[PDB]
Design a protein around this ligand. Structure first.
Ligand code: 2AS
Ligand code: 2AS
Ligand code: MG
Ligand code: MG
Lengths: 411, 411
């Protein structure tokens, strides 16, 4: 079955494009807005509305497959592609991509996914968000053309068993790290709460005591508010590199502080994401490795998670091959085509790496819903609740699609 | 085409259920919740997780139609049904509704909508939430059965033109009445921002001076933040009956105060929702009517919107026939089956009432999306960005489905 028509429509994503460089440089705020000038190219303000381009593929049987082109919050940075402005992309996609979609067969997914993932227009690979969104629509197209769910298509093309089982979900709080923790306990969240620990003075503390107290409050809040002791979630907190900054980038000292955090967790397993940011891929790998070695040496139970500098399928391979850390964030939109997500989760699973199928608050209901199918197939150990910073909406989108899908499969 | 199988799966909706008058009474606060004793039946806490029940209808052609059972935040009051918990409704659904669904013809939508809207089980009508959800899935089923969009099915069956054109959207800030305003300006929202002006002391002011100052703040923010004068949104603020409280239900005084806000809006049109709560339908209609009369007499351009006591199709008919206000909130889940939304909006449109197709923060991505199709067909004057209180997620849901659907229709 073929695609009869391809449509591209501008839209709003579930968060904001932020100029990471200007913010790190110390941009001030006025309400929700950041002040000063942006320094990153394409930005009209330090903070701007997040945008997406919805792809709809009307098939010969009349079904309408969907996918959303979307980029991370910090669109333009850390090895991630540029400022994804949608209006500009509509004419471009209508002109160069539409004729490559209309009349295309979608009985299978992968050959199509590979094609768009490698395509250059005037020498330039397609923007990674376009690859993300097209690939979602193509997966959905294969599903709709054959009476399968997206999950089944992946299972079939990658020859996976497709045993219907929940994926642990992870909630991110943004700066609302107290109120959102309550929300997450009320809704049974498996993993929590990110906490956006992204400033040294005000969030980590110059000697780490602020984070220490935060973990204690968090575990106390969980134990106290839970309906029963059967609720025993995992703690996952992203420190956006700040721990290296207070320990002279010495991985032994970083490890030491990290281990010291376990006590405050009160039996809840603990994960610390992005402990350091050495500023380039090779050094990031090596520092994470050295931190992991010392945690082991200490007999620590605390685990660490890579994110920055770990972007593409190949990066994920590299961090994994090096034994650098216990888990890596597969930040979905930065991989491009979603077949890359499947490939990356399987590689991790084969080689011992815990795969966290993450993403961004700045993607959509469609991209998240598509990611749910990818996860139910590939079996990562953790999935980000997304998109949005409200949390409730994200949980609604990911959790309910997961459970609907498991039921359909059990049929 | 018939439905082959009906599945019902538990999920989370995008907000919380709250025992109202457990709270307004004196329920304590600790972080995100309320301490102590709920007054409302079924409730294990004064606030707990909002819930839904996803209805999935697998048809003979293998398509899967979807719809979500959901209820407002304070299920329980203003003329609303009980506590919509999944563990209760899933058995009820399997016991009493599945037998009427499996094998059912879905070639049309309206018979089925009407049939379930009237159905009695042991003498009782079905819960509005159940009727809302089934009806969404039944409309989706008719669509998927015949290669139509849900919006087209409504157009076909009520004989409407379905001109592909946008509907003005309204965002709601929840208590975050400052910060969410910046979000909305940055996303160009048509109407804003609700403001949850729901307490005399802290939000409206004993003499309405706080709301007065807020309106000026809001208009200034808009005029300051916007990128050009082309952005001229409508201001829409819900004061949840507080204006009636500080004026002792004196309607001429209410009107006078409401007219004095125009000055503060600086030329942005102003809507005040729920100015009073007379605690009963017939008094509510009378009070709103006298407020409207006095506004007109003063020559004011401020309009008022009904909400509380205007629940069902028939309520809407009654508020409309009395000429009681300029706009009514058709609070979607309370009408039961969504064909009633259609009839309500058309009724308003035919009898000089502005139809505001509302809903709640506590519904779902699926209910909202389905509400988009109802609106493109019926043409209310305004539609709520929902669900959730994060705003971004809701806009993403409602605005992107709207634009995607318009693009399909133009095909
Ligand atoms: C999940 C991401 C991370 O911090 O790793 C980030 N908060 C985002 O939403 O894009
Ligand atoms: C939109 C409603 C209203 O206040 O009219 C309410 N905020 C709700 O979300 O259910
Ligand atoms: Mg991270
Ligand atoms: Mg209201």
């Amino acid at each position: 079955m073929k695609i009869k028509q391809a449509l591209f429509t501008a839209g709003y994503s579930s968060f904001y494009f932020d100029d990471q460089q200007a913010i790190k440089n110390g941009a001030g705020h006025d309400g929700f807005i950041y002040t000063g000038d942006p320094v990153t190219p394409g930005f009209t303000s330090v903070r701007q509305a997040g945008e997406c381009v919805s792809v709809q593929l009307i098939l010969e049987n009349g079904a309408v497959a969907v996918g959303d082109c979307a980029a991370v919050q910090y669109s333009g940075a850390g090895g991630r592609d540029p400022l994804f402005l949608a209006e500009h992309f509509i004419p471009f996609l209508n002109d160069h991509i539409k004729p490559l979609l209309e009349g295309r067969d979608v009985d299978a997914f992968l050959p199509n996914a590979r094609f768009f993932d490698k395509l250059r227009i005037d020498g330039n690979l397609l923007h990674t968000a376009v690859r993300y969104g097209l690939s979602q629509a193509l997966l959905d197209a294969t599903a709709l053309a054959s009476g399968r769910l997206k999950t089944e298509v992946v299972c079939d093309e990658w020859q996976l068993p497709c045993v219907p089982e929940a994926i642990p979900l992870f909630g991110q709080s943004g700066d609302d790290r107290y109120i959102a923790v309550d929300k997450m306990i009320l809704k049974g969240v498996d993993v929590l709460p990110h906490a956006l620990i992204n400033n040294v003075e005000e969030k980590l503390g110059f000697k780490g005591e602020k984070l220490r107290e935060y973990v204690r409050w968090l575990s106390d809040r969980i134990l106290s508010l839970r309906s029963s002791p059967r609720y025993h979630p995992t703690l996952h907190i992203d420190v956006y590199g700040t721990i290296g900054l207070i320990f002279d980038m010495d991985p032994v000292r970083c490890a030491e502080y990290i281990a010291s955090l376990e006590k405050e967790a009160q039996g809840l397993p603990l994960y610390i994401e992005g402990p350091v940011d050495a500023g380039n891929k090779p050094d990031q790998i090596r520092m994470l490795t050295a931190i992991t070695k010392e945690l082991t040496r200490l007999g620590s139970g605390v685990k660490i998670v890579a994110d920055e500098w770990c972007n593409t399928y190949q990066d994920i391979v590299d961090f994994t091959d090096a034994g650098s850390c216990h888990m890596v964030q597969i930040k979905t939109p930065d991989l491009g085509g979603i077949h890359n997500i499947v490939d990356a989760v399987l590689y991790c699973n084969k080689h011992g790496m815990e795969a966290y199928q993450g993403g961004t608050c700045n993607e959509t209901e469609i991209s998240a819903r598509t990611c749910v199918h990818v996860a139910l197939a590939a079996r990562p150990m953790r999935m980000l609740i997304k998109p949005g910073m409200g949390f409730d909406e994200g949980l609604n989108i990911v959790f309910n699609e997961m459970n609907r899908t498991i039921a359909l499969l059990q049929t």
